[PDB]
PDB file of all heavy atoms in Angstrom:
ATOM      1  N   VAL B  30     104.463 -34.057  15.592  1.00 37.21           N
ATOM      2  CA  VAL B  30     104.879 -33.713  16.973  1.00 37.21           C
ATOM      3  C   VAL B  30     105.352 -32.244  16.896  1.00 37.21           C
ATOM      4  O   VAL B  30     106.000 -31.852  15.963  1.00 37.21           O
ATOM      5  CB  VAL B  30     105.957 -34.629  17.496  1.00 37.21           C
ATOM      6  CG1 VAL B  30     106.516 -34.180  18.846  1.00 37.21           C
ATOM      7  CG2 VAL B  30     105.450 -36.061  17.585  1.00 37.21           C
ATOM      8  N   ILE B  31     104.985 -31.504  17.947  1.00 34.07           N
ATOM      9  CA  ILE B  31     105.511 -30.109  18.107  1.00 34.07           C
ATOM     10  C   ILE B  31     106.288 -30.071  19.405  1.00 34.07           C
ATOM     11  O   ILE B  31     105.825 -30.606  20.491  1.00 34.07           O
ATOM     12  CB  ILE B  31     104.357 -29.065  18.102  1.00 34.07           C
ATOM     13  CG1 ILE B  31     103.616 -29.149  16.764  1.00 34.07           C
ATOM     14  CG2 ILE B  31     104.866 -27.679  18.416  1.00 34.07           C
ATOM     15  CD1 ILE B  31     102.283 -28.331  16.704  1.00 34.07           C
ATOM     16  N   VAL B  32     107.508 -29.508  19.345  1.00 35.29           N
ATOM     17  CA  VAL B  32     108.328 -29.406  20.524  1.00 35.29           C
ATOM     18  C   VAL B  32     108.575 -27.908  20.824  1.00 35.29           C
ATOM     19  O   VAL B  32     108.944 -27.155  19.978  1.00 35.29           O
ATOM     20  CB  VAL B  32     109.707 -30.100  20.365  1.00 35.29           C
ATOM     21  CG1 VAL B  32     110.543 -30.037  21.718  1.00 35.29           C
ATOM     22  CG2 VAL B  32     109.457 -31.596  19.969  1.00 35.29           C
ATOM     23  N   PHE B  33     108.337 -27.519  22.102  1.00 33.21           N
ATOM     24  CA  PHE B  33     108.759 -26.169  22.521  1.00 33.21           C
ATOM     25  C   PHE B  33     110.146 -26.272  23.232  1.00 33.21           C
ATOM     26  O   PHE B  33     110.340 -27.151  24.100  1.00 33.21           O
ATOM     27  CB  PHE B  33     107.809 -25.529  23.534  1.00 33.21           C
ATOM     28  CG  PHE B  33     106.465 -25.159  22.981  1.00 33.21           C
ATOM     29  CD1 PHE B  33     105.475 -24.684  23.908  1.00 33.21           C
ATOM     30  CD2 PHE B  33     106.225 -25.210  21.662  1.00 33.21           C
ATOM     31  CE1 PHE B  33     104.229 -24.270  23.363  1.00 33.21           C
ATOM     32  CE2 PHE B  33     104.908 -24.773  21.177  1.00 33.21           C
ATOM     33  CZ  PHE B  33     103.944 -24.341  22.050  1.00 33.21           C
ATOM     34  N   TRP B  34     111.025 -25.295  22.944  1.00 35.46           N
ATOM     35  CA  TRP B  34     112.354 -25.266  23.533  1.00 35.46           C
ATOM     36  C   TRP B  34     112.789 -23.816  23.661  1.00 35.46           C
ATOM     37  O   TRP B  34     112.039 -22.903  23.395  1.00 35.46           O
ATOM     38  CB  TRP B  34     113.333 -26.112  22.671  1.00 35.46           C
ATOM     39  CG  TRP B  34     113.683 -25.394  21.371  1.00 35.46           C
ATOM     40  CD1 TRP B  34     112.865 -25.125  20.342  1.00 35.46           C
ATOM     41  CD2 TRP B  34     114.994 -24.928  20.995  1.00 35.46           C
ATOM     42  NE1 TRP B  34     113.519 -24.525  19.296  1.00 35.46           N
ATOM     43  CE2 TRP B  34     114.860 -24.351  19.716  1.00 35.46           C
ATOM     44  CE3 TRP B  34     116.266 -24.942  21.608  1.00 35.46           C
ATOM     45  CZ2 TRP B  34     115.957 -23.797  18.990  1.00 35.46           C
ATOM     46  CZ3 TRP B  34     117.298 -24.396  20.906  1.00 35.46           C
ATOM     47  CH2 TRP B  34     117.140 -23.820  19.600  1.00 35.46           C
ATOM     48  N   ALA B  35     114.024 -23.638  24.190  1.00 34.34           N
ATOM     49  CA  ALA B  35     114.701 -22.379  24.119  1.00 34.34           C
ATOM     50  C   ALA B  35     116.197 -22.681  24.089  1.00 34.34           C
ATOM     51  O   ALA B  35     116.649 -23.662  24.666  1.00 34.34           O
ATOM     52  CB  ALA B  35     114.343 -21.488  25.270  1.00 34.34           C
ATOM     53  N   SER B  36     116.998 -21.818  23.402  1.00 34.89           N
ATOM     54  CA  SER B  36     118.413 -22.075  23.273  1.00 34.89           C
ATOM     55  C   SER B  36     119.123 -22.124  24.624  1.00 34.89           C
ATOM     56  O   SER B  36     120.130 -22.918  24.700  1.00 34.89           O
ATOM     57  CB  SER B  36     119.052 -20.950  22.440  1.00 34.89           C
ATOM     58  OG  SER B  36     118.913 -19.706  23.055  1.00 34.89           O
ATOM     59  N   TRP B  37     118.657 -21.523  25.656  1.00 33.56           N
ATOM     60  CA  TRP B  37     119.273 -21.521  26.981  1.00 33.56           C
ATOM     61  C   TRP B  37     118.769 -22.623  27.851  1.00 33.56           C
ATOM     62  O   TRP B  37     119.159 -22.746  29.005  1.00 33.56           O
ATOM     63  CB  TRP B  37     119.103 -20.184  27.685  1.00 33.56           C
ATOM     64  CG  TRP B  37     117.734 -19.577  27.532  1.00 33.56           C
ATOM     65  CD1 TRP B  37     117.407 -18.518  26.702  1.00 33.56           C
ATOM     66  CD2 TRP B  37     116.521 -19.988  28.175  1.00 33.56           C
ATOM     67  NE1 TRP B  37     116.072 -18.243  26.823  1.00 33.56           N
ATOM     68  CE2 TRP B  37     115.489 -19.058  27.724  1.00 33.56           C
ATOM     69  CE3 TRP B  37     116.182 -20.993  29.095  1.00 33.56           C
ATOM     70  CZ2 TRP B  37     114.133 -19.199  28.177  1.00 33.56           C
ATOM     71  CZ3 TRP B  37     114.840 -21.044  29.572  1.00 33.56           C
ATOM     72  CH2 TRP B  37     113.840 -20.197  29.043  1.00 33.56           C
ATOM     73  N   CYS B  38     117.817 -23.463  27.343  1.00 31.56           N
ATOM     74  CA  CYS B  38     117.161 -24.464  28.156  1.00 31.56           C
ATOM     75  C   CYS B  38     117.972 -25.802  28.070  1.00 31.56           C
ATOM     76  O   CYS B  38     117.878 -26.513  27.047  1.00 31.56           O
ATOM     77  CB  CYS B  38     115.718 -24.621  27.763  1.00 31.56           C
ATOM     78  SG  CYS B  38     114.961 -25.943  28.745  1.00 31.56           S
ATOM     79  N   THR B  39     118.751 -26.026  29.075  1.00 31.29           N
ATOM     80  CA  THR B  39     119.574 -27.208  29.131  1.00 31.29           C
ATOM     81  C   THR B  39     118.808 -28.515  29.011  1.00 31.29           C
ATOM     82  O   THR B  39     119.208 -29.427  28.278  1.00 31.29           O
ATOM     83  CB  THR B  39     120.442 -27.164  30.442  1.00 31.29           C
ATOM     84  OG1 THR B  39     120.952 -25.820  30.715  1.00 31.29           O
ATOM     85  CG2 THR B  39     121.637 -28.157  30.345  1.00 31.29           C
ATOM     86  N   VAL B  40     117.733 -28.558  29.733  1.00 31.10           N
ATOM     87  CA  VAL B  40     116.846 -29.805  29.752  1.00 31.10           C
ATOM     88  C   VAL B  40     116.236 -30.055  28.351  1.00 31.10           C
ATOM     89  O   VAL B  40     116.222 -31.208  27.903  1.00 31.10           O
ATOM     90  CB  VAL B  40     115.781 -29.667  30.847  1.00 31.10           C
ATOM     91  CG1 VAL B  40     114.649 -30.690  30.657  1.00 31.10           C
ATOM     92  CG2 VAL B  40     116.391 -29.765  32.216  1.00 31.10           C
ATOM     93  N   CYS B  41     115.778 -29.035  27.666  1.00 30.99           N
ATOM     94  CA  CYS B  41     115.354 -29.139  26.278  1.00 30.99           C
ATOM     95  C   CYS B  41     116.370 -29.717  25.352  1.00 30.99           C
ATOM     96  O   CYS B  41     116.088 -30.709  24.687  1.00 30.99           O
ATOM     97  CB  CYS B  41     114.942 -27.797  25.674  1.00 30.99           C
ATOM     98  SG  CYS B  41     113.675 -26.948  26.533  1.00 30.99           S
ATOM     99  N   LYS B  42     117.559 -29.185  25.390  1.00 28.86           N
ATOM    100  CA  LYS B  42     118.618 -29.627  24.462  1.00 28.86           C
ATOM    101  C   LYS B  42     119.063 -31.057  24.768  1.00 28.86           C
ATOM    102  O   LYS B  42     119.332 -31.828  23.811  1.00 28.86           O
ATOM    103  CB  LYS B  42     119.788 -28.592  24.555  1.00 28.86           C
ATOM    104  CG  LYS B  42     119.342 -27.196  24.083  1.00 28.86           C
ATOM    105  CD  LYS B  42     120.527 -26.192  24.088  1.00 28.86           C
ATOM    106  CE  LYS B  42     120.895 -25.837  25.530  1.00 28.86           C
ATOM    107  NZ  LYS B  42     122.054 -24.824  25.538  1.00 28.86           N
ATOM    108  N   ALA B  43     119.025 -31.421  26.060  1.00 28.73           N
ATOM    109  CA  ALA B  43     119.337 -32.823  26.458  1.00 28.73           C
ATOM    110  C   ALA B  43     118.354 -33.859  25.888  1.00 28.73           C
ATOM    111  O   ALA B  43     118.735 -35.012  25.733  1.00 28.73           O
ATOM    112  CB  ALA B  43     119.338 -32.930  28.012  1.00 28.73           C
ATOM    113  N   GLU B  44     117.112 -33.417  25.660  1.00 28.40           N
ATOM    114  CA  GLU B  44     116.031 -34.264  25.027  1.00 28.40           C
ATOM    115  C   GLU B  44     116.117 -34.443  23.520  1.00 28.40           C
ATOM    116  O   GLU B  44     115.490 -35.346  22.950  1.00 28.40           O
ATOM    117  CB  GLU B  44     114.686 -33.630  25.286  1.00 28.40           C
ATOM    118  CG  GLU B  44     113.978 -34.000  26.529  1.00 28.40           C
ATOM    119  CD  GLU B  44     112.858 -33.053  26.795  1.00 28.40           C
ATOM    120  OE1 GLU B  44     112.054 -32.745  25.876  1.00 28.40           O
ATOM    121  OE2 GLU B  44     112.721 -32.595  27.962  1.00 28.40           O
ATOM    122  N   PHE B  45     116.833 -33.514  22.836  1.00 30.71           N
ATOM    123  CA  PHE B  45     116.754 -33.501  21.323  1.00 30.71           C
ATOM    124  C   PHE B  45     117.289 -34.761  20.702  1.00 30.71           C
ATOM    125  O   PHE B  45     116.722 -35.226  19.754  1.00 30.71           O
ATOM    126  CB  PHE B  45     117.474 -32.285  20.780  1.00 30.71           C
ATOM    127  CG  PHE B  45     116.654 -31.009  20.875  1.00 30.71           C
ATOM    128  CD1 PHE B  45     117.307 -29.756  20.994  1.00 30.71           C
ATOM    129  CD2 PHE B  45     115.284 -31.012  20.886  1.00 30.71           C
ATOM    130  CE1 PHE B  45     116.630 -28.579  21.069  1.00 30.71           C
ATOM    131  CE2 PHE B  45     114.558 -29.795  20.987  1.00 30.71           C
ATOM    132  CZ  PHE B  45     115.247 -28.623  21.064  1.00 30.71           C
ATOM    133  N   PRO B  46     118.463 -35.348  21.222  1.00 32.61           N
ATOM    134  CA  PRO B  46     118.946 -36.557  20.515  1.00 32.61           C
ATOM    135  C   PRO B  46     117.869 -37.621  20.450  1.00 32.61           C
ATOM    136  O   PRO B  46     117.703 -38.286  19.426  1.00 32.61           O
ATOM    137  CB  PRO B  46     120.113 -36.982  21.411  1.00 32.61           C
ATOM    138  CG  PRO B  46     120.636 -35.713  21.913  1.00 32.61           C
ATOM    139  CD  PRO B  46     119.400 -34.920  22.261  1.00 32.61           C
ATOM    140  N   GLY B  47     117.170 -37.869  21.558  1.00 26.46           N
ATOM    141  CA  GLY B  47     116.136 -38.938  21.638  1.00 26.46           C
ATOM    142  C   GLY B  47     114.937 -38.660  20.790  1.00 26.46           C
ATOM    143  O   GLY B  47     114.442 -39.522  20.114  1.00 26.46           O
TER     144      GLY B  47
END
Side-chain angles (χ1 to χ4, degrees):
Chain B
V30 173
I31 297 169
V32 182
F33 291 173
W34 72 296
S36 65
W37 41 257
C38 179
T39 317
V40 166
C41 297
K42 297 181 289 181
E44 271 167 45
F45 284 151

